[PDB]
Amino acid sequence: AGKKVLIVYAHQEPKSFNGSLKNVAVDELSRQGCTVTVSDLYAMNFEPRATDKDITGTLSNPEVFNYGVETHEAYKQRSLASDITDEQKKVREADLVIFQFPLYWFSVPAILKGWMDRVLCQGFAFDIPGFYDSGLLQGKLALLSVTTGGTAEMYTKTGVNGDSRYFLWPLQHGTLHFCGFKVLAPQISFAPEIASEEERKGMVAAWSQRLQTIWKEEPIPCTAHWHFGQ
Amino acid sequence: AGKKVLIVYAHQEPKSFNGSLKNVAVDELSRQGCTVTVSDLYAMNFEPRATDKDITGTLSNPEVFNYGVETHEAYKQRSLASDITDEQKKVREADLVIFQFPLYWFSVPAILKGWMDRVLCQGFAFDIPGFYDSGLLQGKLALLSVTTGGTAEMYTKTGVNGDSRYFLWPLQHGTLHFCGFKVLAPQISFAPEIASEEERKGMVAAWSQRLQTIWKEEPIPCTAHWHFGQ
Numbered sequence: 001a002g003k004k005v006l007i008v009y010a011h012q013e014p015k016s017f018n019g020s021l022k023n024v025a026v027d028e029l030s031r032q033g034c035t036v037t038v039s040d041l042y043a044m045n046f047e048p049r050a051t052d053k054d055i056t057g058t059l060s061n062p063e064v065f066n067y068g069v070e071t072h073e074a075y076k077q078r079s080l081a082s083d084i085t086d087e088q089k090k091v092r093e094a095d096l097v098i099f100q101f102p103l104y105w106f107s108v109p110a111i112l113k114g115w116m117d118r119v120l121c122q123g124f125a126f127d128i129p130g131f132y133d134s135g136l137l138q139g140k141l142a143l144l145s146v147t148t149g150g151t152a153e154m155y156t157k158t159g160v161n162g163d164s165r166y167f168l169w170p171l172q173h174g175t176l177h178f179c180g181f182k183v184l185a186p187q188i189s190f191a192p193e194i195a196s197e198e199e200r201k202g203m204v205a206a207w208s209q210r211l212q213t214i215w216k217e218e219p220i221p222c223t224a225h226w227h228f229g230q
Numbered sequence: 231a232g233k234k235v236l237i238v239y240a241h242q243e244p245k246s247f248n249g250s251l252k253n254v255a256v257d258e259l260s261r262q263g264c265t266v267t268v269s270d271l272y273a274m275n276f277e278p279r280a281t282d283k284d285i286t287g288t289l290s291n292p293e294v295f296n297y298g299v300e301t302h303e304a305y306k307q308r309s310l311a312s313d314i315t316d317e318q319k320k321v322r323e324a325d326l327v328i329f330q331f332p333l334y335w336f337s338v339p340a341i342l343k344g345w346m347d348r349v350l351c352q353g354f355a356f357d358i359p360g361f362y363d364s365g366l367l368q369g370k371l372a373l374l375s376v377t378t379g380g381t382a383e384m385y386t387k388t389g390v391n392g393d394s395r396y397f398l399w400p401l402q403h404g405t406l407h408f409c410g411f412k413v414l415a416p417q418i419s420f421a422p423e424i425a426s427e428e429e430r431k432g433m434v435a436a437w438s439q440r441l442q443t444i445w446k447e448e449p450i451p452c453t454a455h456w457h458f459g460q
């Protein structure tokens with residue numbers, strides 16, 4: 001309670017394991033008295049493409065379109081498309097942002113990659129300078145709650161996929177820490193589709209139980225050593 | 231020559247540095263006598279979202295939508311949407327696939343992430359016995375030609391962004407190698423917007439020159455060691 005949470009959710013099916021993890025987060029955080037908002041990207045038909053339709057005012061350089069330059073200016077002038085503005089309001093108000101999604105090619109599904117590309121624009125999430133520890137979303141927490149097709153054993157240093165932390169780098173360091181977020185430890189629910197029903201219920205319960213004490217957690221040291229070792 | 235190349239290109243502006251790199255690749259490979267095709271994703275308004283519209287006709291299980299299962303079955307039953315199958319035909323016929331794009335959040339822009347998510351489906355790009363070395367696109371070459379906002383020095387082990395090889399992992403190993411591609415060394419054009427015109431013409435020239443002998447190259451060893459060294 002006394003906290004606002006935004007859950008950015010990326011799954012097409014309400015009945016899925018991801019849907020259950022999203023619902024258990026809403027239920028638990030709601031029970032605690034926290035304020036909770038969910039951006040259900042597929043239900044919103046959220047636009048993932050970074051295009052000139054994202055700026056509604058006069059372009060800074062109409063001869064040669066530069067998405068980053070134009071969205072930075074549009075943010076400052078308040079001429080960004082309203083879908084982007086609506087998400088920035090949710091992020092601005094949130095104390096914790098949880099991303100709930102199935103891993104697609106060792107990363108986030110494209111609809112959620114689009115949310116990162118379009119919502120986290122210069123001027124809003126970072127500035128030059130004003131990134132990493134000085135990012136604009138400093139003071140906020142972020143957490144990746146990911147599900148995988150591959151097993152935990154495949155995601156180890158000696159497994160075929162390498163350690164799970166390796167693929168977290170672009171997201172935790174390159175994106176969240178770059179924008180100033182303090183990153184909480186990822187929640188990784190391995191291979192639910194081939195797990196037993198008891199194991200799945202167990203993974204949902206472990207997430208619910210973790211959320212009970214989420215506000216007492218410290219963030220991870222978002223560094224190369226944490227992700228890669230040595 | 232006697233080779234087919236597909237360039238999957240993700241930039242909004244034809245006059246951009248990315249546009250120039252795409253154009254010299256088409257020019258050089260066409261001069262060599264190679265068969266060249268370009269999927270200009272923004273011009274195609276390529277759909278990035280993984281949804282049930284990707285399957286035509288009746289769904290395998292219309293009570294609980296599972297994208298991976300539905301697209302695997304649709305691939306086997308020849309019922310995938312035409313935008314996806316049009317791209318799969320280009321890939322199937324290609325000997326080399328070059329991805330040309332600006333780095334967005336240490337990864338590919340969402341429209342290109344969408345192409346990977348939707349085009350590289352089970353049955354087409356990978357299957358139970360076929361992945362990594364036995365991936366279904368084995369025999370084909372793939373190459374990432376990336377442009378960055380950050381300077382090369384920022385992309386060093388002690389630079390703020392970390393070694394560039396760190397962010398290449400989900401793309402080169404988790405995606406390309408996983409599908410069976412032999413991965414050629416990435417072409418990284420660091421910070422073209424900050425560079426002088428000479429340094430830029432210099433980077434465009436290095437790319438054109440490299441393409442002259444591209445078929446003489448051996449692929450990189452796509453391992454955790456190559457990426458995280460040490």
Ligand SMILES: Cc1cc2nc3c(=O)[nH]c(=O)nc-3n(C[C@H](O)[C@H](O)[C@H](O)COP(=O)(O)OP(=O)(O)OC[C@H]3O[C@@H](n4cnc5c(N)ncnc54)[C@H](O)[C@@H]3O)c2cc1C
Nearest residue numbers: 016017018020102103104105106147148149150193200298
């Ligand atoms: C394009 C694409 C790319 C991919 N790339 C990767 C990759 O790089 N790496 C990788 O490892 N995987 C990858 N995958 C696999 C993907 O990560 C998994 O398919 C996904 O994580 C599974 O989560 P889900 O919610 O879709 O599962 P579900 O299909 O929902 O499976 C979970 C099962 O649990 C049941 N269930 C739901 N709620 C509950 C509950 N509360 N209690 C008990 N049971 C419940 C469901 O009915 C279901 O049978 C990819 C998939 C696609 C489509």
Ligand SMILES: Cc1cc2nc3c(=O)[nH]c(=O)nc-3n(C[C@H](O)[C@H](O)[C@H](O)COP(=O)(O)OP(=O)(O)OC[C@H]3O[C@@H](n4cnc5c(N)ncnc54)[C@H](O)[C@@H]3O)c2cc1C
Nearest residue numbers: 068246247248250332333334335336377378379380423430
């Ligand atoms: C959403 C988003 C996320 C981003 N995330 C990251 C990130 O994680 N890491 C990072 O490092 N960067 C990031 N960036 C920055 C991005 O990677 C760079 O802006 C992009 O790579 C620059 O390439 P460009 O083609 O857009 O450049 P341009 O704007 O085209 O700059 C090159 C200059 O050269 C000119 N030019 C074009 N062709 C030629 C030619 N043949 N010869 C000479 N000059 C020529 C152009 O007109 C231009 O002035 C991000 C940007 C956005 C919008």
Ligand SMILES: COc1ccc2[nH]c(I)c(CCNC(C)=O)c2c1
Nearest residue numbers: 105106149150151298299352404408
């Ligand atoms: C890098 O790893 C990837 C990449 C793409 C993938 N698309 C699907 I569907 C899966 C899950 C199938 N594997 C298992 C073990 O269940 C998958 C895994």
Ligand SMILES: COc1ccc2[nH]c(I)c(CCNC(C)=O)c2c1
Nearest residue numbers: 068122128174178335336379380381
């Ligand atoms: C991790 O690094 C990122 C992340 C997101 C970014 N969005 C933009 I626009 C940039 C270019 C900013 N300039 C430099 C030199 O980096 C950018 C860089």
Ligand SMILES: [Cl-]
Nearest residue numbers: 356357358361
């Ligand atoms: Cl598999």
Ligand SMILES: [Cl-]
Nearest residue numbers: 442443444446
């Ligand atoms: Cl040679």
Ligand SMILES: [Zn+2]
Nearest residue numbers: 173177222223
């Ligand atoms: Zn970090």
Ligand SMILES: [Zn+2]
Nearest residue numbers: 403407452453
């Ligand atoms: Zn590899």
